């Protein structure tokens, strides 16, 4: 009685475009074109697909199948699979928090640009502003200029001294105080996700119609726009020129694997939640297949969208697009790409749809990000919770604002990197490995093939079987070992992070991980019996 059976989605296309909305984000736009053109160019497509087929797709489809089959949250599903690994559901809840502290501040920057892009003369065109230094040298100014080590462009000056105000902080040590503009921007973001999540899957699923389709439109406008620019073939040459020798490096495969994993994002509980609210009779194999193939191809065309404008920018400057595309991160889109689109007719248009496109890219993904955690807590503490959804949703949203207050600082950008590199990647890889191993090895991949066989009507192929049993946990294990062995020294804006950052990072990387061995200790520590007896009753799910 009472609630009993769970709710169901409003249409097939909503959940298709919804999982597509989670899959597609900023990184699809600029991360993949950079990592592609840097690691052997077009040849990077060869391992990228392999790491997709053997790694990303199986985790994606396994996660999705479990989600639609068991209809449980990220915490409650472990109660009915492997209770000792229930802490996994908790770990994600912490991980997501760390992500929601920086991912939306980027959307706040794109939002600050968007509202600052309504003026007839764009701010980052002239140097006669209140934030530019004496180094600021700009165009529509005398030709022959010969750039100096200390000179700075109006776009770099605008991004550095205004929207970030990063010159007012010395690094991780001193980063305060808070830029209230980005606080209001990210507040508006938390509002626009508040009215798109608070109701549940119906609103996220309806806002997704806009947040997942518009990026293709803006990418299409900047695509046909960037294609008509003179000398844009340079960026395409640098973008797709095959350099097969780079394929001999054992690093490149690692980069491809990490890319496809962190662009499909399986085992994060978001796909579990998005899959939970669907029909048991409804097919999901085709769903997972098509959805991934969209995320990959969308990245492929996004490469052109970036490197066409970068090619035109390298033509107006002096070629070897790599030099104009050295820095990967927020500067490739907020400085180089913005300064590139500044010299184009009706620049207000392309600017508005560009930064609006950035916000539109982050919105759907963060919808899904929150959706997974919300589903997990509501399903884990029912009746004690579900009293209202706006209460718990409001709680997690304002929590994400207070979490971003460290990021809204002057040196917030610094923290963004520290959180983007150190915290998420190793832990997420770990929980994906433990999750995959627990579904494929503990629960038994045989019974999983029986669950899919009861789901779609047919048992999954021997390919999916061997991928889940061996190829996928080895796929995650590869990136785990390669990551731990060579953690990266990182620098941002002529500032090398202190030697101790990794320590801090490891804290932020493990402070979220402590819950699973301590929960195994809590489970095995709480029920008396013998060690062999209690772990045998704790590995087998509920019989009824």
């Amino acid at each position, epitope marked *: 009685g009472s609630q009993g059976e769970r709710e169901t989605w409003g249409k097939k296309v909503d959940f298709l475009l919804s999982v597509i909305g989670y899959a597609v984000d900023l990184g699809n736009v600029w991360r993949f074109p950079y990592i592609c053109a840097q690691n052997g160019g077009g040849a990077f497509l060869l391992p990228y697909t392999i790491m997709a087929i053997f790694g990303g797709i199986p985790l994606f489809y396994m996660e999705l199948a479990l989600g639609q089959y068991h209809r449980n949250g990220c915490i409650s599903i472990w109660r009915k699979i492997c209770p000792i690994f229930k802490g996994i559901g908790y770990a994600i809840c912490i991980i997501a928090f760390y992500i929601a502290s920086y991912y939306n501040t980027i959307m706040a920057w794109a939002l600050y640009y968007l509202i600052s892009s309504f003026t007839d003369q764009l701010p980052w065109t002239s140097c006669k502003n209140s934030w530019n230094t004496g180094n600021c040298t700009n165009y529509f100014s005398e030709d022959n200029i010969t750039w100096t080590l200390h000179s700075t462009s109006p776009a770099e000056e605008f991004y550095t001294r205004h929207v970030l105000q990063i010159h007012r902080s010395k690094g991780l040590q001193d980063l305060g105080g808070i830029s209230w503009q980005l606080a209001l921007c990210i507040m508006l973001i938390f509002t626009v996700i508040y009215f798109s999540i608070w109701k549940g899957v119906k609103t996220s699923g309806k806002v997704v119609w806009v947040t997942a389709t518009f990026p293709y439109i803006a990418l299409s406008v900047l695509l046909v726009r960037g294609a008509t620019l003179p000398g844009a073939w340079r960026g395409v040459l640098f973008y797709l020129k095959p350099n097969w020798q780079k394929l001999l490096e054992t690093g490149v495969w690692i980069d491809a694997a990490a890319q496809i994993f962190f662009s499909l994002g399986p085992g994060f509980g978001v796909l579990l939640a998005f899959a939970s609210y669907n029909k048991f009779n409804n097919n999901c194999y085709q769903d997972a297949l098509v959805t991934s193939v969209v995320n990959c191809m969308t990245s492929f065309v996004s490469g052109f969208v970036i490197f066409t404008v970068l090619g035109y920018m390298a033509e107006m400057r*002096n*070629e070897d697009v790599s030099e104009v595309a050295k820095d990967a991160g927020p500067s490739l889109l907020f400085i180089t790409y913005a300064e590139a689109i500044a010299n184009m007719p009706a620049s207000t248009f392309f600017a508005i749809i560009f930064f609006l496109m950035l916000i539109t890219l982050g919105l759907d993904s963060t919808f899904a990000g929150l959706e997974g955690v919300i589903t997990a807590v509501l399903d884990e503490f029912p009746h004690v919770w579900a009293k209202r959804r706006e209460r718990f949703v409001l709680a997690v949203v304002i929590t994400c604002f207070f979490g971003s207050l460290v990021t809204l600082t002057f040196g917030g950008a610094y923290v963004v990197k520290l959180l983007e590199e150190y915290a998420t990647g190793p832990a997420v890889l770990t929980v994906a490995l433990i999750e995959a191993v627990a579904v494929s090895w503990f629960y038994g991949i045989t019974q999983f093939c029986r669950d899919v066989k009861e789901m779609l009507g047919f048992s999954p192929g021997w390919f999916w079987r061997i991928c889940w049993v061996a190829i996928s946990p080895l796929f995650l294990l590869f990136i785990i070992a390669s990551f731990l062995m060579s953690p990266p020294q990182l620098r941002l804006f002529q500032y090398n992070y202190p030697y101790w950052s990794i320590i801090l990072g490891y804290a932020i990387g493990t402070s979220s991980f402590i819950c699973i061995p301590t929960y195994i200790a809590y489970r095995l520590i709480i029920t008396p019996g013998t060690f062999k007896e209690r772990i045998i009753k704790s590995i087998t799910p509920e019989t009824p």
Partner: antibody, heavy 119, light 108 residues
Framework: EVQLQQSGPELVKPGASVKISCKAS????????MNWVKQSHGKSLEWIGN????????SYNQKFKGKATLTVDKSSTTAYMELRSLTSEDSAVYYC????????????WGQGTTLTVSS | DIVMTQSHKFMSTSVGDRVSITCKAS??????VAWYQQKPGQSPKLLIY???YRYTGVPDRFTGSGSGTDFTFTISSVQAEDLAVYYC?????????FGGGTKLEIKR
């Protein structure tokens, strides 16, 4: 005006090391890249690498990686290039030349440094 | 990398004649070629940058042209002191490479 006074000629036995200086003057030293070009007897110019005087930002050539080591000192506005594993091919004239960051031309050069690697 | 090829190692000219040295690059360069003048016993002296622009302190008798891959250095009034070895160098892709060097010998 702008002057790049290099060091004198050096006669060094093969297998040893040799360091060449480059006293820069007449401009804001921190405002320009400091480059090193190799010129073999009867050969063309050969770009060794550059260095950012502010932080010692060395950007070498794959052909000279591990062959030359560029350093810089702001306290005296002087850039140095050290060479190890000296052979008969290194017996060439070396120049230190100033360059902006873009466009990357070599506006001012040094007088050259005659290096002879022989026992 | 980039291979700057000066097919003609030597070129003969006279005082007052119109002389022009060619320069072939590996790939498309747009307008990123600089011409240097190394007089026998002196350091290379910068004459042209970015294909056509002249550098400061260079007489009007030195000009540059070309747009794409092949570029040309022109002297209208050759003087007795214009006797030198001319090099061409690209300035767009890392690393920066030079030409083989064209010695300009004067005929009298």
């Amino acid at each position: 005006e702008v002057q790049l006074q290099q060091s004198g000629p050096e006669l060094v036995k093969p297998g040893a090391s040799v360091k060449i200086s480059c006293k820069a003057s007449g401009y804001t030293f921190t405002d320009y890249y400091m480059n090193w070009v190799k010129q073999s007897h009867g050969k063309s110019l050969e770009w060794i690498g550059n260095i950012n005087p502010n932080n010692g930002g060395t950007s070498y050539n794959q052909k000279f990686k591990g062959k030359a080591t560029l350093t810089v000192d702001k306290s005296s506005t002087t850039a140095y290039m050290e060479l190890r594993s000296l052979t008969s091919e290194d017996s060439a004239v070396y120049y230190c030349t100033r360059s902006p960051v873009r466009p990357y031309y070599f506006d001012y050069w040094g007088q050259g440094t005659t290096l002879t690697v022989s026992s | 990398d980039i291979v700057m090829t000066q097919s003609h190692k030597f070129m003969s000219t006279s005082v007052g004649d119109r002389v022009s040295i060619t320069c072939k690059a590996s790939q498309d360069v747009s307008t990123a070629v600089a011409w240097y003048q190394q007089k026998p016993g002196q350091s290379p002296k910068l004459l042209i940058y970015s294909a056509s622009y002249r550098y400061t302190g260079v007489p009007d008798r030195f000009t540059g042209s070309g747009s794409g891959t092949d570029f040309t250095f022109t002297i209208s009034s050759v003087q007795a002191e214009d006797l030198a070895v001319y090099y061409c160098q690209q300035h767009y892709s890392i690393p920066r490479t030079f030409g083989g060097g064209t010695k300009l010998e004067i005929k009298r």
